[PDB]
């Protein structure tokens, strides 16, 4: 992959996988993504346990499941893992809803 | 400037 772009429209379901991890989770991972404006920005982990509605889910294999991505989840994924070998597998999806920005406040 | 990712 390497910075793929993705399209996305408000209110739809968008899926990304995080380039490293095997079918199911290894070790431990963490996972960074970059929305809005600048006070957005989350860490994702491999475990949300929290609301779909309001954000999105993280699958067990370690993927990232989303209900419906908002104007305001607009931004960029970028995702991290280390494998038993040593190296790390980097992961960066931009993606792209379908109002965008201008004039922000 | 967006993360990684720049276009």
């Known amino acids: 992959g390497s910075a793929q772009n993705?399209?996305?429209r408000i209110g739809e379901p968008?899926?990304?996988?995080?380039?490293?991890?095997?079918?199911?989770?290894?070790?431990?991972?963490e996972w960074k993504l970059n929305t809005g404006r600048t006070?957005?920005?989350?860490?994702?982990?491999?475990?949300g346990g929290g609301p779909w509605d309001?954000?999105?889910?993280?699958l067990p294999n370690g993927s990232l499941f989303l209900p419906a991505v908002g104007?305001?989840?607009?931004g960029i994924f970028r995702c991290q893992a280390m494998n038993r070998n040593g190296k790390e597998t980097k992961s960066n999806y931009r993606v792209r809803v379908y109002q965008?920005?201008?004039?922000?406040e | 400037?967006?993360?990684?990712?720049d276009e």
């Open chain 1, 6 to 8: 993705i399209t996305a």
């Open chain 1, 14 to 29: 968008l899926v990304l996988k995080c380039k490293g991890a095997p079918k199911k989770p290894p070790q431990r991972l």
């Open chain 1, 39 to 47: 006070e957005a920005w989350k860490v994702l982990s491999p475990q």
């Open chain 1, 54 to 58: 309001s954000v999105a889910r993280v």
């Open chain 1, 71 to 74: 104007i305001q989840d607009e």
């Open chain 1, 100 to 104: 965008i920005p201008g004039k922000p």
């Open chain 2, 1 to 5: 400037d967006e993360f990684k990712a």
